Amino acid sequence: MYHGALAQHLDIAQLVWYAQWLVIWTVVLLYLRREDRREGYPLVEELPYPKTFVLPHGGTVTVPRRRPETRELKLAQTDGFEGAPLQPTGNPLVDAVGPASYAERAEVVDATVDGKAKIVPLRVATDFSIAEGDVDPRGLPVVAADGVEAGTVTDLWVDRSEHYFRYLELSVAGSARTALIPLGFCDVKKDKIVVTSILSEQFANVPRLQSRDQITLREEDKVSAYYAGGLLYATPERAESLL
Amino acid sequence: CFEPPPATTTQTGFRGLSMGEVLHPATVKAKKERDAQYPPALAAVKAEGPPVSQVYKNVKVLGNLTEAEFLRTMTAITEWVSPQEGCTYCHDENNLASEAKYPYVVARRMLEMTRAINTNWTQHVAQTGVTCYTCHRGTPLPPYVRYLEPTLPLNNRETPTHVERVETRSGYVVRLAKYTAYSALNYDPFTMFLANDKRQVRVVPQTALPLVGVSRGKERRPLSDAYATFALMMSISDSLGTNCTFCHNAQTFESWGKKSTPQRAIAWWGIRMVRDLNMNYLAPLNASLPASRLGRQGEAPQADCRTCHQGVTKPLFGASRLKDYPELGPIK
Amino acid sequence: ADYQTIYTQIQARGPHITVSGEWGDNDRVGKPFYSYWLGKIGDAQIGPIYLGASGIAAFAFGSTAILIILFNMAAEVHFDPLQFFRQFFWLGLYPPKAQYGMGIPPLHDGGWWLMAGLFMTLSLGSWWIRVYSRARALGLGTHIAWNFAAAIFFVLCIGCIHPTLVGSWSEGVPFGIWPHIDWLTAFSIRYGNFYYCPWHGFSIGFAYGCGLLFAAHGATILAVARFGGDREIEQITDRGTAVERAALFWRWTIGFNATIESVHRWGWFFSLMVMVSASVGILLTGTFVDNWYLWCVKHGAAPDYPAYLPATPDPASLPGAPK
Amino acid sequence: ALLSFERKYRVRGGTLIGGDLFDFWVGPYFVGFFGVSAIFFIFLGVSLIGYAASQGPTWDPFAISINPPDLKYGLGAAPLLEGGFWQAITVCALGAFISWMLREVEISRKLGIGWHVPLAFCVPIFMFCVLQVFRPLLLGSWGHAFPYGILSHLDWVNNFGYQYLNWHYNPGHMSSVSFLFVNAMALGLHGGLILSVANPGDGDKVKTAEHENQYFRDVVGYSIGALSIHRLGLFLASNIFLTGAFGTIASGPFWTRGWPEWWGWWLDIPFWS
Ligand code: BCB
Ligand code: BCB
Ligand code: BCB
Ligand SMILES: C/C=C1/c2cc3[nH]c4c(c3C)C(=O)[C@H](C(=O)OC)c4c3nc(cc4[nH]c(cc(n2)[C@@H]1C)c(C(C)=O)c4C)[C@@H](C)[C@@H]3CCC(=O)OC/C=C(\C)CCC[C@H](C)CCC[C@H](C)CCCC(C)C
Ligand SMILES: CC(C)=CCC/C(C)=C/CC/C(C)=C/CC/C(C)=C/CC/C(C)=C/CC/C(C)=C/CC/C(C)=C/CC1=C(C)C(=O)c2ccccc2C1=O
Ligand code: HEC
Ligand code: HEC
Ligand code: HEC
Ligand code: HEC
Ligand SMILES: CC(C)=CCC/C(C)=C/C=C\C(C)=C\C=C\C(C)=C\C=C/C=C(C)/C=C/C=C(\C)CC/C=C(\C)CCCC(C)C
Ligand SMILES: [Fe+2]
């Protein structure tokens, strides 16, 4: 006789093989693929029961978000096929469409574990500093994609929870305002900050903050999205084929 | 540290299986030059006249040869085994019938061993055969022998370092490693598998499922047997200057038929031959050798694959003297 | 390009943060210090570290195992320090070479190996309690502890459960650099080629898949770092453009996508399954399958090839062949 | 057929070549020039696999195998039945993989995100090239490449290893393996961490960035950080192949002995020998 042998030419490892595949396909199709549908459904143009999170600082949220309001999209169809691309009908940067699009995040300031504003300028975060060895960009010029100085750095905005800089704030030459820029759109040199995502003139229409010394989650999205839009829209050539 | 290309590669399996030899040309060339030192056959001589069983006093193995044939064998043996010292390595210079020097008695046994290899072990040596030179390579002590503990250097013509010497305990693991192609396998496959016929090289089941009665607790062979078999294979691979795929399709090491090469069956016969040489011809010579030739347990030096092969898949690249020296076998 | 995805151009320094746990706050040890160069590609802060009873026990038990292993390795070179350093990778502490079954083997042939294994097991269990309990003390789920549990179980399968199921401590894994590696081949050989074990294949598919998934997810988040995609917890509770773009990149490429929460489930599951698959393969090996290649031939799955050199009969079967 | 938030992102632009011509979707799939070229190579490749497979011994998915030529064909064309199908399928595969990569660049550009994914995908494509193109070129025959069969390719891997006696002693393999394992572990830890914060259990509050860093500082005395774990995971995963490739390319072209013997550089130093 043989260990593992069952009636027929069946054996134990053989039965375990079927079981293993059944488990894997069950987990993938009946669990993971359902978890994958907690955002973006129902589809437009098999679903799990809604998920509720108890938030760190009071209140709850249930996902996916349903918003009491709806944004208008300044986009025109290019042709009539189901899957034709859409085209901006105005200034895509200001209208926030395509890669200039932002999400309708909460109009609330992201908090630290202790309930303070998380992302704040160093003028507020007076206990924070720049590590010795790195450039202090305050007072340096910002040079845009066209090689023209757009303004001058006034402050750095720090994440107080992760100890990490996330934005620079600059005065916008000729516009009596300041603007934020995510550090991911900044090439930090000793004598200047280089920004190739947008042209000098385009800094005047960067989304404005409601308050000078704090920023909401939605505002962070609007700010970041504007510069990403520039990658495709700063000039007409940027939408056309590279080659 | 590295070996510059090109590499010489051969194919020993169906296309797409990555089976074959992988060789460095400069290494092959150097071994070919060394092996080419094999002295050529002596001139043929007179086949007629009385047998030396009649002519000489103490001829017990080669008695049917004529005098010219017998002295030709003696000349050949001398060049192959003791060229620097000549006839008197084995003979009392004033009495050639005398057996007083230990090499004489050893050489008689060696004549019998050589004839036995070429007569009884054709499944291994085929019609290529061996002579004294195959092992001795011009010196009384063959360059590649084994004791009942691992020894370094592998080639005994090289001077050992202090740590290589067998009495230096700290060097043991390196002595073992250098016999198993630098692996850490904690087994001496010479003493386990080649000194005698006590162990089974095969360790892999020939059924899909475990057989009831051989598969639980002390019914079972310890897993150590599988490491020891891997050590033997590492040692054989290095001894022949080759890799596993010369003999096996690694898909199934335990399968014959299409899954093994003809060379694997030859290797199997080689294991059997070496065991016979060692048990029946070489180990018993401890009684005839001086103390200075013996290992620490009183053992005579013995043979492994490298003794003949010396890093080549065929000893001396297949050079032969079989037809030149019919007195070394095969004997009818 | 987003140079921030390469390194931190301008590092920030602030007062160190301490999040209070339900117990153990007074058992954190170390003055933190900062490394400028590390702060280019990670947090610059090093320390403090939590002590606690389970961590201290882990260290004690683990150190004991390590001393047993090292002492035995030193004995292997007759306690010569230069040869220890030279030969280190070749040195080991071995399971029993003789078959004693499930008998506690002689110290000199497997006993010290079993003792080191016991102290290693106590160390891993102690560390598990630390990993589990730190999550609880901080009000976190225990997802890390359960992943770690599968990895530990796999170590237990190759260290002691397989040995117990077949009834021989000789089958355990040695301690040592080359020696534990040497075991992989001995075990594969003994059991008929691990390439033919389905569970070995499953484990590899999941291990390769972790490679694929961490590359893809790592890269995805770097690609959306400009939108704060790295702030994954608030992207979960309040979806932003970072993870909308991340999902659409994948949806447009492969035709389906995950969410920022669910990608972490995929990765956790794949990682877990490397270990779960490997464990099941090991548990079946020797117990219910003796030769994986032949089990596959039995079930008609193994590839076959034409002879290249002529088919070679087993000479052991020839009439009058020696044993 | 669109996610609820998807419409605002479906704009023209970002292509590398072709312009508007192929800038559209089929269901959820972006097309583009490299969508067309990828389908073309996939269709050709899979069609050759079907035709080749039908000339062989078996239709069992485990056992089917499309093999390269004998070594004796060198780098030349081989007959279709004796290695030529393999050669044609290799070209199609490379075409498909590269097309796939460049399509990902287009998708990245349209979404205004970085190109990190297609760059990362260059790593496995490179490793395929090492195994199937570079190493065979250095050895001078396509026949050193791996066959296309679910189980047969494992027979190749197996024999390749053992041609160098014990492949586990290959230093580039040792690095490759260490990265595979640390990567798997790190994905577990990372996935686990994120889930532990968002899913504390019961009616408990979701936790914070600060809690993530506290957890690893407590357990190991260091937390790498939330952006940095993503760069690290990409580094670890990539280095599976980036270091492995050296071990693969060395075996045959730069080393003909067994791998354990390579360590004689260390072991055989005269002053401790
Ligand atoms: C140098 C080492 C190699 C290696 C060693 C190897 C080992 C040791 C093992 C495998 C295994 C596997 N390998 Mg192989 N491998 C494979 C594909 C495969 C799968 C059959 C399987 C699971 C892999 C997986 O889940 O990965 C992660 C990716 C995931 C999870 C995404 C899904 C991928 C999907 C399963 C791929 C399916 C490919 C199909 C054969 C279809 C082929 C294309 C068709 C449409 C023409 C491909 C497609 C390639 C290419 C293109 O290079 C490749 C190269 C290699 N593998 C090298 C030759 N691989 C395992 C197996 O079970 O084999 C039977 C296994 O044990
Ligand atoms: C010739 C030999 C082979 C072999 C033999 C083999 C064996 C015997 C086993 C595997 C197994 C496995 N193999 Mg395979 N293998 C693999 C891949 C793999 C792994 C995915 C898988 C699981 C092991 C693992 O993740 O361990 C790494 C993870 C570990 C060890 C977890 C450790 C966790 C622990 C909690 C950490 C503790 C650390 C502490 C600090 C320690 C402190 C100690 C002190 C106190 C003393 C690939 C990709 C290939 C290729 C490409 O050829 C391959 C070929 C081979 N394998 C050859 C066929 N392999 C395993 C498996 O699946 O079997 C079914 C397995 O048992
Ligand atoms: C007996 C032989 C052995 C061996 C022989 C071996 C060889 C010969 C090689 C490795 C290599 C490697 N081995 Mg090793 N091995 C490994 C691990 C590994 C890997 C980390 C590494 C790289 C694998 C690779 O190249 O994938 C390649 C995967 C590729 C190229 C995937 C390409 C994907 C493509 C771009 C996209 C494919 C798409 C599909 C066709 C799409 C299908 C459509 C569907 C999905 C819709 C482990 C963990 C073990 C264990 C546990 O023992 C082990 C044992 C062994 N290996 C034995 C000792 N191994 C390689 C290495 O780096 O060595 C230094 C290597 O060459
Ligand atoms: C260290 C870096 C890692 C890494 C990284 C990344 N991995 C990526 C990305 C990144 C970043 C993506 O962006 C991309 C993707 O979209 O993800 C969802 C992707 C992908 N990785 C896949 C498979 C995969 N990744 C593996 C390994 C790693 N990935 C390593 C670990 C392995 C192993 C290990 O075996 C496999 C099998 C596909 C699922 C997908 C390409 C699909 C494709 O190219 O479509 C285009 C081509 C096809 C759809 C089919 C082509 C059919 C040809 C013509 C005919 C078959 C020929 C073939 C040679 C026959 C082989 C048969 C035989 C061996 C049985
Ligand atoms: C119909 C037709 C012919 C159309 C022509 C147009 C065209 C070119 C069509 C393409 C058709 C083809 C070839 C389809 C095949 C598509 C392929 C290759 C599918 C492979 C799927 C596989 C095996 C993936 C392996 C990885 C895997 C396990 C993924 C599952 C989890 C997912 C979806 C991860 C992706 C993912 C990651 C990695 C994030 O980090 C992330 C972060 C935040 C939000 C979302 C995400 C997210 O979705
Ligand atoms: C050891 C390797 C030897 C060397 C070197 C030489 N000879 Fe030898 N001799 C040897 C043996 C084992 C025997 C007996 C062979 C047998 O079949 O039993 C012999 C015998 C002789 C004899 C016969 C003497 C007699 O019995 O009367 C002679 C004349 C002889 N050998 C000559 C000889 C010469 C000339 C040598 C050098 C060229 C020589 N031998 C070398 C062993 C060995
Ligand atoms: C390998 C299979 C051998 C062949 C073929 C021949 N001999 Fe040998 N010899 C061999 C070994 C392993 C040993 C023991 C080691 C030792 O050197 O003692 C020997 C020994 C001898 C000796 C004694 C040498 C000495 O100790 O001084 C002699 C004289 C001798 N062998 C002679 C000899 C002859 C004449 C052979 C052909 C007929 C021959 N040997 C073949 C290994 C092998
Ligand atoms: C021919 C010259 C070989 C080379 C090179 C290698 N191996 Fe081998 N192998 C060979 C033979 C003649 C035998 C059978 C011996 C006997 O006395 O029966 C073996 C056996 C094995 C086994 C055991 C098979 C079984 O049935 O249990 C294994 C696992 C094995 N060999 C592996 C192996 C490896 C890993 C090799 C390279 C390192 C290798 N072999 C080389 C012949 C030859
Ligand atoms: C001398 C006495 C030998 C010893 C000891 C071993 N081998 Fe040998 N081998 C010897 C000869 C004279 C020949 C040539 C036979 C021929 O057909 O030409 C061989 C041949 C082999 C081969 C075949 C190589 C090939 O055909 O290409 C193999 C695989 C081989 N030998 C293996 C082998 C092994 C594994 C040995 C130790 C166990 C071994 N040989 C010892 C002579 C001698
Ligand atoms: C000093 C510095 C800081 C650290 C030193 C690190 C160091 C040098 C360590 C020692 C040398 C090294 C690196 C050794 C490496 C060994 C390796 C890689 C070993 C790997 C694996 C070993 C394994 C899986 C062994 C498992 C064994 C077990 C699970 C045994 C289990 C036994 C039990 C559960 C006991 C129950 C049975 C009862 C009857 C006693
Ligand atoms: Fe993440």
User: In this structure, how many other beta carbons lie within 10 angstroms of the beta carbon of residue A39?
Assistant: 23
Whether residues D33 and D142 fall in one domain: yes
Contact D169 B163 (CB under 8 A): no
3-state secondary structure chain B: CCCCCCCEECCCCCCCCCCCCEECHHHHHHHHHHHCCCCCCCCCCCCCCCEHHHHCCCCCCCCCCEHHHHHHHHHHHHHHHCCCCHHHHCCECCECCCCCCHHHHHHHHHHHHHHHHHHHCHHHHCCCCCCHHHHHCCCCCCCCCECCCCCCCCCCCCCCCCCCCCCCHHHHHHHHHCCCCCCCCCCCHHHHHHCCCCCCCCCCCCCCCCECCCCCHHHCCCCHHHHHHHHHHHHHHHHCCCCHHHCECHHHCCCCECCECHHHHHHHHHHHHHHHHHHHHHHHHHHCCCHHHCCCCCCCCECCHHHHHCCCCCHHHHCCCCCCCHHHCCCC
What is the residue with the minimal CA distance to atom 43 of ligand 6?
Answer: B90
B1 is known to lie in a ligand binding site: no
Residues on chain B touching C101 (C-beta within 8 angstroms):
217-218
Are the C-beta atoms of residues B145 and B157 closer than 8 Å to each other? no
3 state SS of C28: strand
Rounded to whole angstroms, the Cα distance separating C202 from C211 reads 14
Closest residue by Cα to atom 39, ligand 7, is B132
**3 state DSSP class of C296:** helix
What does the block give as tokens for D81? Answer: 């039945």
- Whether the CB of C272 sits within 6 Å of ligand 2: no
Domain A2-104 class, CATH top level: few secondary structures
**Domain residue limits, chain C:** 1-143, 144-302
Residue of A nearest to B216 (CA): A3
Give one DSSP letter per residue of D49-114, joined into a string. HHHHHHTSS---TTT--B----GGGTTS---GGGTHHHHHHHHHHHHHHHHHHHHHHHHHHHTT--
How far apart are alpha carbons C6 and C9 in whole angstroms?
A: 9
Strand-pair partners of C286: none
Chain D contact for C218, CB < 8 A? yes
Residue A84 exposed, middle or buried by CB count within 10 Å (0-12, 13-18, 19+): middle
Indicate which CATH number applies to the domain containing D40. Answer: 1.20.85.10
- Report yes or no: A241 and A111 within 8 Å, Cβ to Cβ: no
Which residue is closest in CA terms to ligand 10's atom 15? C176
**Angstrom distance (rounded) from CA D95 to CA D129:** 12
Q: How many CB atoms lie within 10 A of CB D156?
A: 25
From atom 39 of ligand 2, which residue's Cα is the shortest distance away?
C124
Closest ligand 8 atom number to CA of residue B193: 17
Interior/surface letters C76-106, b for 16+ CB within 10 angstroms, e for the rest? bbeebeebbebbebbbbbbbbbebbbeeebe
Three-state DSSP class for D29? strand
H-helix segments, chain D = 32-54, 84-110, 116-129, 135-139, 152-162, 171-198, 209-220, 228-250, 259-262, 264-267
Contacts of A128 (CB under 8 A, 6+ apart): A122, A158, A160, A163, C12, C13, C14
Q: How far is A84 from chain D (nearest CA, A)?
A: 5
Listed in sequence order, the residues at least 6 apart from B51 whose beta carbon sits closer than 8 Å to its beta carbon are B63, B64, B65, B66
Helix, strand, or coil (residue D255): strand
Identify which of D36, D46, D121 to mutate to test ligand 4's pocket (most ligand atoms within 8 A of the CB): D121
Whole-angstrom distance, CA of residue B59 vs CA of residue B61: 6
Chain A nearest C-alpha distance from B215 (Å)? 8
Residue with tokens 């490491």: B227
Looking at the structure, tell me whether residues D40 and D171 fall in a common domain: no
Local structure of residue D221 (DSSP, 8 states): S
| Pairing status of strand A141-143 against strand A193-194 | parallel
- Structural tokens at position A215: 């920023």
In this structure, are D20 and D84 located in the same domain? yes
d(CA B268, CA C175): 33
Do D228 and D236 meet the contact criterion of CB atoms below 8 Å apart?
no
Q: Among B307, B259, B264, which residue's Cα sits nearest to residue B124?
A: B264
Structure tokens at A140: 């340096």
Sign, CA dihedral C117-C118-C120-C121, equals: positive
Which of D13, D107, C4 is closest to A234 using CA atoms? D13
Question: Which DSSP helix (H) or strand (E) runs through C233?
Answer: helix C232-237
Report residue A133: phi and psi, to 5°.
115, -25
Same domain, D178 and D156: no
Out of B61, B62, B72, B87, give the residue to mutate to test ligand 6, the one with the largest number of ligand atoms within 8 Å of its CB: B87
Nearest CA-CA partner of B104 in B137, B57, B51, B47: B57
Give how far C164 is from chain B: nearest CA, Å: 9
Exposure pattern of B231-253 as b/e (b: 16+ CB <10 Å)? Answer: bbbbbbbbbbbbbbbbbbbbbbb
Which superfamily is assigned to C144-302 in CATH? Photosystem II protein D1-like (1.20.85.10)
Give the distance (Å) from ligand 4 centre to CA of residue C212.
Answer: 9
Q: Would you call A132 an interface residue with chain D, using a CB distance cutoff of 8 Å?
A: no
Domain extent at residue D190: 166-273
The tokens describing B37, both together, are 């030192």
User: Cβ C138–D112 below 8 Å, yes or no?
Assistant: no
**In the PDB record, what is the listed experimental method?**
X-ray
Given the structure tokens 């959306």, which residue do they identify?
A: C224
* Nearest one of C122, C111, C128, C106 to C61, comparing CA atoms: C122
**Which residue reads 């400009």 in tokens?**
C226
Classify the C-alpha dihedral D145-D151-D152-D154 as positive or negative.
Answer: positive
Q: For residue C103, what are the CA distances in angstroms to C97, C164, C173, C242?
A: 13, 11, 17, 60
Q: Name the CATH superfamily, with its identifier, for domain A105-243.
A: Photosynthetic Reaction Center, subunit H, domain 2 (3.90.50.10)
Residue of C208, C220, C248, C265 to mutate, ligand 5, most atoms within 8 A of C-beta: C220
Region at D17 (left for phi over 0; alpha for psi -120 to 50; beta for the rest): beta
Tokens of B87: 């006839």
Q: Are residues D117 and D93 in the same domain?
A: yes
CA–CA distance, A149 with A163 (Å, rounded to integer)? 29
> Measured between alpha carbons, how far is A41 from A44 in angstroms, rounded to an integer?
8
Contact A172, A187 (CB under 8 A): no
CB contact under 8 A, D103 and C251: no
Integer-rounded Cα Rg, in Å, for chain D is 24
CA gap B136, B106 in Å, rounded:
13
Q: Within a 10 A sphere around the Cβ of D38, how many other Cβ atoms?
A: 21
Write out the two tokens for B258.
């299409």
DSSP annotation string for chain A: -BTTB-STT-BHHHHHHHHHHHHHHHIIIIIIHHHTTSSS-S-B--PPPPEEEE-TTS-EEEES---SS-PPP-EEESSSSTTPPEEESS-HHHHT-GGG------SSB-B-TTSSBSEEETTT-TT-EEPTTS---TTPEEE-TTS-EEEEEEEEEEETTTTEEEEEEEEETTTTEEEEEEGGG-EE-SS-EE--SS-GGGGGGSPPPSSSS--BHHHHHHHHHHHHHHHHHSSGGGGS---
Nearest to D166 among C86, C185, C303 (CB): C185
Backbone angles phi, psi at C181, to 5 degrees: -65, -45
Both structure tokens of C318 = 């020839």
Tally Cβ neighbours within 10 Å of residue B23: 18
Category of C20 on φ-ψ map: left (φ > 0), alpha (ψ -120 to 50) or beta? beta
Among D5, D109, D204, the residue with its CB nearest the CB of A103 is: D5
**Residues B156, B143: Cα–Cα separation, whole Å:** 5
For chain D, what is the domain count? 2
Q: Residue D140 and residue D128: Cα distance in Å, rounded? A: 17
- The answer on D207 and D112 residing in a single domain is no
Query: How far is Cα A55 from Cα A78, in angstroms, rounded to an integer?
Result: 43
List CB contacts (< 8 A) between A133 and chain C: 11, 36
Length of chain B: 332
The answer to whether the beta carbons of residues B10 and D140 sit under 8 Å apart is no
Tokens for B190?
């010479």
What architecture is the C1-143 domain classified under in CATH? Up-down Bundle (1.20)
Paired tokens of D256: 């003909």
Q: What is the resolution of this structure in A?
A: 1.9
The DSSP secondary structure of A35-52, one letter per residue, reads HTTSSS-S-B--PPPPEE
Q: Whose CA is nearest to atom 12 of ligand 4?
A: D121
With an 8 Å Cβ cutoff, are A228 and D112 in contact? yes
Residue of C nearest to A196 (CA): C1
Tokens representing D197 are 């914060």
Which atom of ligand 4 lies closest to the CA of D97? 44
Question: Binding site annotation covers B162?
Answer: no
Closest ligand to C-alpha of residue C152 is: 2
Report which secondary-structure segment, H or E, holds C221.
helix C198-223
Phi, psi of A64 (to 5 degrees): -70, 145
All domains in chain B, ordered by first residue? 24-142+314-332 (1.10.468.10), 143-205+221-313 (1.10.468.10)
**Backbone breaks in chain A after residues (C–N over 2.5 Å):** 45
D162 neighbors B250 (Cβ within 8 angstroms): yes
Do D138 and D232 share a structural domain?
no
Q: By CA distance, what is D199's nearest residue in A?
A: A53
Domain shared by D107 and D175, yes or no: no
With beta carbons less than 8 A apart as the criterion, state whether B329 and B172 touch: no
Contact indicator for D186, D194 with CB cutoff of 8 Å: no
Closest-CA residue to D256 (of D170, D176, D143): D170
Contacts of D152 (CB under 8 A, 6+ apart): B16, C303, C305, D64, D65, D67
Among D131, D165, D199, which residue terminates a domain?
D165
- Are residues D186 and D256 located together in one domain of the fold? yes
Tell me how far apart the alpha carbons of residues B164 and B171 are, in angstroms, rounded to a whole number.
6
DSSP helix/strand/coil, D30: strand
Tell me which H or E stretch contains C45.
strand C45-46
Work out the end-to-end distance of chain B between its first and last CA atoms, rounded to an integer number of angstroms. 52
* Sign of the C-alpha dihedral computed for residues C279, C285, C288 and C292 taken in this order: positive
Please report how many Cα atoms fall inside a 13 Å half-sphere around the Cα of residue D214, on the Cβ side. 26
Q: Is C181 in the pocket of ligand 10 (CB under 6 A)?
A: no
Q: Give the CB-side neighbour count of residue A97, counting CA atoms within 13 A.
A: 21
* Residue C108: count of CB within 10 angstroms of its CB: 10
DSSP assignment letter at D17: S
Q: How far is the CA of C69 from the centre of ligand 7 (A)?
A: 45
Relative to the CA of C216, which ligand 4 atom is closest?
A: 11
So where are chain A's domains?
2-104, 105-243
Of D61, D50, D45, which Cα lies nearest the Cα of D151? D61
Size of chain C, expressed as the number of residues it contains? 323
- Would you call A221 an interface residue with chain C, using a CB distance cutoff of 8 Å? yes
**Cβ atoms B275, B232 nearer than 8 A:** no
Instruction: Please say which residue of D138, D165, D192 terminates a domain.
Output: D165
Alpha carbons B240 and B311: distance in angstroms, whole number: 4
Give Cα separations from A225 to A87, A94, A152, A219, A221 (angstroms): 17, 10, 21, 10, 6
